[PDB]
Paper text:
The structure of FadE1 and FadE2 were solved to a resolution of 2.08 Å and 1.94 Å, respectively. Consistent with the AUC data, each asymmetric unit contained two homodimers arranged along a crystallographic 2-fold axis. In the structure of FadE1, we noted some additional electron density, which did not correspond to any crystallization additive, but was consistent with the presence of a bound fatty acyl-CoA moiety. The best-fit for this acyl-CoA moiety was octanoyl-CoA, presumably acquired from the E. coli host prior to purification. The acyl-CoA substrate was sandwiched between a probable catalytic residue (Glu441) and the FAD moiety. One FAD molecule was bound in each protomer of FadE1 and FadE2. The His6 tags were proteolytically removed, and the molecular mass of the resulting native proteins was assessed using analytical ultracentrifugation (AUC). This revealed that FadE1 and FadE2 are likely to be dimeric in solution. The first ca. 460 residues from both proteins comprised a pair of α-helix-rich domains (the N- and CI-domains) separated by a β-sheet domain (residues 160-280). The C-terminal ca. 140 residues of each protein formed a distinct α-helical bundle in which the helices are stacked perpendicular to those in the adjacent domains.
Author numbering:
A (entry chain B): 3 to 601
B (entry chain A): 2 to 601
Write the structure that this text describes.
Amino acid sequence: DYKAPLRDIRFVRDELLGYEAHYQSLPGAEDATPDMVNAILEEGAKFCEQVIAPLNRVGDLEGCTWSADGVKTPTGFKEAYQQFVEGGWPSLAHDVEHGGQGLPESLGLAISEMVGQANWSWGMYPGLSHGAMNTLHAHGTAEQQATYLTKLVSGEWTGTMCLTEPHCGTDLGMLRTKAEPQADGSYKVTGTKIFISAGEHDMADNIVHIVLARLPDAPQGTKGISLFIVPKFLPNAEGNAGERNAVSCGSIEHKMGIHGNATCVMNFDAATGFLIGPPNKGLNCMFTFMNTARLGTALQGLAHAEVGFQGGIAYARERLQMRSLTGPKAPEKPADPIIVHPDVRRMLLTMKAFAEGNRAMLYFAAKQVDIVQRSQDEEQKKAADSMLAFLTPIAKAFMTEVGFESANHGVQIFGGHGFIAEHGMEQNVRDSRISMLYEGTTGVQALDLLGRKVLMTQGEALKGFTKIVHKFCQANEANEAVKEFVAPLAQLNKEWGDLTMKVGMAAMKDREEVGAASVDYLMYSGYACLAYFWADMARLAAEKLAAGTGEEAFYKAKLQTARFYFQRILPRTRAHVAAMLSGANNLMEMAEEDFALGY
Amino acid sequence: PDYKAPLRDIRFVRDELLGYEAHYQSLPGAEDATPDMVNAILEEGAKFCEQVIAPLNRVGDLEGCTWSADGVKTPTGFKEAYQQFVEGGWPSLAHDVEHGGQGLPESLGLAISEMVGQANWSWGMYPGLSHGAMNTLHAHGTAEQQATYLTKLVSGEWTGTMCLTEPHCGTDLGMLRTKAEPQADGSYKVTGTKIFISAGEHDMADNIVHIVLARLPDAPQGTKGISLFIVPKFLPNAEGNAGERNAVSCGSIEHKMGIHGNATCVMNFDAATGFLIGPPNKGLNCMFTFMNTARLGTALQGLAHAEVGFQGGIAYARERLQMRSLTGPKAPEKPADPIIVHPDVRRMLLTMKAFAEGNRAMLYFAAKQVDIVQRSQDEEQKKAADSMLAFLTPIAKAFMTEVGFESANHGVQIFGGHGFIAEHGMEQNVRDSRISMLYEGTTGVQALDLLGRKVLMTQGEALKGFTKIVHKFCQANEANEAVKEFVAPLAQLNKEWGDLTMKVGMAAMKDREEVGAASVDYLMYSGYACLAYFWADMARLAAEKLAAGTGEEAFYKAKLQTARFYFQRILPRTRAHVAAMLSGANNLMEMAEEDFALGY
Ligand SMILES: CCCCCCCC(=O)SCCNC(=O)CCNC(=O)[C@H](O)C(C)(C)COP(=O)(O)OP(=O)(O)OC[C@H]1O[C@@H](n2cnc3c(N)ncnc32)[C@H](O)[C@@H]1OP(=O)(O)O
Ligand SMILES: CCCCCCCC(=O)SCCNC(=O)CCNC(=O)[C@H](O)C(C)(C)COP(=O)(O)OP(=O)(O)OC[C@H]1O[C@@H](n2cnc3c(N)ncnc32)[C@H](O)[C@@H]1OP(=O)(O)O
Ligand SMILES: Cc1cc2nc3c(=O)[nH]c(=O)nc-3n(C[C@H](O)[C@H](O)[C@H](O)COP(=O)(O)OP(=O)(O)OC[C@H]3O[C@@H](n4cnc5c(N)ncnc54)[C@H](O)[C@@H]3O)c2cc1C
Ligand SMILES: Cc1cc2nc3c(=O)[nH]c(=O)nc-3n(C[C@H](O)[C@H](O)[C@H](O)COP(=O)(O)OP(=O)(O)OC[C@H]3O[C@@H](n4cnc5c(N)ncnc54)[C@H](O)[C@@H]3O)c2cc1C
């Protein structure tokens, strides 16, 4: 049964990253008192454990049901959503201006961490909505905010992002949905959008589609794309679901997992829409909706490692099979618990290193998001903004990739039993698999990080982070407790920058290099980020243990996980380095027609 | 694009790389495996796989199996397909002539199995499990027992199961508690519940022959007390046909992640009549003819998953237009470039390709050993082939399943979002693949078998058979210009493999936890090392065919390019596995069990 990691969320927020100081230093956070944060975490935890976690298996077994009239969600989904609404969770991290509580985004993200762990398919309904707000908030006219945002902040209305068509997913410049301008200055949108998460459902009073379309004589490619508000129901005089717009769901997908989230073919038959933001600047505006959900999807990766660990640790202490290699440890039982086996511990510690490591990186990133939304200092916003732009793609691709690995360790620990539906471990793997495909594929994210962010800033995007690491190795070089962490961390911090330079050099001779190195580089970057977060959690752990503490075992575990990370996981860097220095030719020399001559 | 048998690559591996013509002529009873007959059987094999079973793979996954009190319904088309397969004589192919068989080599029967598992693994488990229980009756059954059970299994009229697992025990068979009470007439009565029995009950055959692990009434504790019993669903009648219903029933089937089409049964034996096969209390010894077949059989499942991901991905990579090459549009007449222009898509393609073609080479290398163990009359050769199988069998099962799962996941990644959708079949490949690392011995258990039972128990001798072959290859080709670039790293790695074995040994002397701590890393390293040899050898062969002039230049140029990719982008994974296995057991054993979950 899902148990929220509140003690670990507090370790990371309060002790490692000084979230009380951060909230004190920052406009809006006077109502975000330590005691109020703790009560909101504990309220969040209870909803996640008692209301949505028990629906997770229901959602997988039932999925959603299509008919011409609309889409039924699994038993208990909408009734949990009504309770989510009535608790005012939707309004937590939105402007007091448009009906919100004004608490920071980073406190919103802690609630999303627990929602995603408990029931990801259910959490996507509120999750997508949270983004369309961030879109309306950043680019909507005051009247658009008054009509649409107020309703999303209350949760009475839900939001989607409608980009994808059959022929285009990464290549949005090829999109072909049309916005035809009308005398009254509104548009009629004609097109078929596919894979639309939460496109049709029975959870809310209305749905607000944020749709990418093209104006009749716009330029080709991205520079021809505009953003439209297309609600399922056009508002009435009081602002409530009014006239039924010509938006309908023609079908939902049969998928490997995330069955409880309706994945919809949305047909727009000259549906009334309103332009939001400048004509042909839709891609620019949509990237508010996208970088929310990039960090929101990095959260999915964290959730799959956490669920995989919760299951693994429980089964490894309860399942008896075979005996310890150093003699029977439970001779009064017919077998030893499987935790006594070194490989089961390797699998448990892998999931633990990834869950706790990525939790640190995620709430480090979330502090940057708060700064960009609320700081007055433009030096401090701009340094936060460049840090988000470096960490966003790393977090999304790296946390999902190792989250899916972590989910598979969970299954492996159960042996055969892991393949069987009733234990929920195999559902975790199935739900994890989409996280590396949507919200920018691993490959597209890697290309974004290395080409657009790092190589296009001639390495400056990396320097923000390698600065913090270099300052840690200097302040802690002669700290005896983390000597063993600082040495290889300093070495890796150097190599990180060296590799960045060698790849820029290779790329100057052959552009194919940016692609050839990209995923290897992003994965290396991910292990290097977590090397720093584990060296720092180890530093904090050693500080607390030397000062005496009610929780000896808590901090000794942090040191033991850090050492596992450095000695057993971080050396995967060696293969990422070798592959990325090998050059583009070993990928590009084979002719397309020569890949499958063995038939 | 539907399933296409990789016959051209299967021929390259057996005929060109592994000398299968000369091997078959050097073996007693292999005179009927003429090159033209093998090629005829391979063609008929592919026809059956591509036309009868491959179309049923989606149906198997959508319907799965339907339980009722009376029986277990199989997916639409499966039993009719099993009839055409019986009518084709396929079950009889690699079995002895006197018991209904055609007497062809096991390594020919394995080529058919390669194509069956790629076409529809769930369906292939039905005959594939039969193939096991036949091998056990051959090895350990009385001539009477072979007359009744082995003849029906060789015809395919009856199917066979392996019944080991119970709720409390899968790896630890010593704890099993299924009982066998002696009866006055020399038969036994088996009472107990077995779980996760593949093909335990279905509607495809006239009878099912269970090979059951059970305990005699005063047997010693542990594996020393396990005996092996034939328990048929229908007791034979006087003619030798399905007679009296035995007290064997299926209480349920599991709901699973995958292989929905293969019924996974809770089998209740209610004092069912069984017959002791093999000595009393030597069950586990006898049941290991069945288990090693099924381990090289499960390695083949790993190959199958890599193959299916490759066939889907290459077709989609050439048809899907998304974005443009980094070096300017390669298809400017089209609205976007094929995704194969992107280096990362080529990286996923070539990963699946290195693993499929490398593992195929490893598999038929192993299958030549099976053939020598079964047929050779030279003892020195039987001993060396037996010893080579002992080393390769767990490497093949664990490595090929693990890199098979990776390869299936690359397949989905190439389709992007579309790969998560049921219609394309790529996500089923991943879900079917996941069981392959759990059953027939877990990755962790095969890794302990390799390092603990075979390698360290022989003080490194089990490794020598293979390192010898690799060292002779590096000497034979030190001066060979076309492959010098493979030979150098191969010889460095072959030496390191021997050094690592000794160091792990030294570490285990001080701390026995080191055997489990190094096990999976050591098996994965060993896997990568085996494929480094096979890619080097396939690169040598391709150089030799190109220097001599061939009408298939591209085919041989593609082997060199894949071998170079394997060496430069995949083999370096050994770096991670070396560092992990030399890190020590303390980084895994120091954390007390009660301190693993203190964040709640
Ligand atoms: C929570 C559950 C998840 C469910 C959601 C499912 C997924 C979805 O909703 S659809 C996912 C959306 N798609 C993706 O994320 C990946 C596919 N699209 C891409 O990212 C493509 O690479 C794509 C379309 C951006 C390429 O466009 P292209 O015009 O070549 O980009 P580029 O020239 O680099 O940038 C164009 C403009 O976009 C914006 N932009 C691009 N990248 C970024 C970025 N990383 N951050 C911010 N803005 C960006 C900028 O305004 C930029 O302007 P400029 O060029 O002057 O800097
Ligand atoms: C094609 C269709 C595929 C479908 C797959 C579905 C089928 C299944 O999943 S059923 C198979 C699942 N069962 C297993 O694999 C059980 C797991 N196995 C194990 O853990 C061990 O091998 C086990 C329990 C059998 C032996 O345990 P233990 O007694 O501690 O081993 P050990 O003492 O070293 O050896 C016991 C005896 O078994 C035999 N044995 C052990 N290992 C091997 C081996 N690798 N090869 C051959 N014989 C072996 C020997 O006879 C040995 O006796 P001795 O040591 O005197 O030679
Ligand atoms: C779909 C399916 C089909 C099956 N078909 C059959 C069949 O036809 N016939 C049959 O007899 N069985 C069958 N099985 C059972 C299957 O072989 C077992 O699941 C397998 O042997 C593992 O046993 P277990 O699941 O009980 O895991 P356990 O043995 O409990 O192992 C659990 C975990 O502990 C680890 N572990 C255990 N001991 C050690 C050790 N000493 N060192 C290190 N790690 C260790 C394992 O590696 C694993 O990670 C089937 C299973 C499934 C799921
Ligand atoms: C369950 C689900 C829910 C979804 N929900 C939504 C939603 O709510 N809203 C929405 O708008 N979309 C949604 N999508 C669509 C999703 O965002 C796309 O699937 C995703 O962007 C990938 O696009 P694609 O599937 O068309 O693959 P493609 O873009 O065709 O990519 C295919 C392959 O090519 C690779 N590739 C493509 N271009 C390059 C390049 N330049 N360099 C390197 N590799 C490249 C990719 O990495 C991938 O491996 C959803 C999809 C799914 C499966």
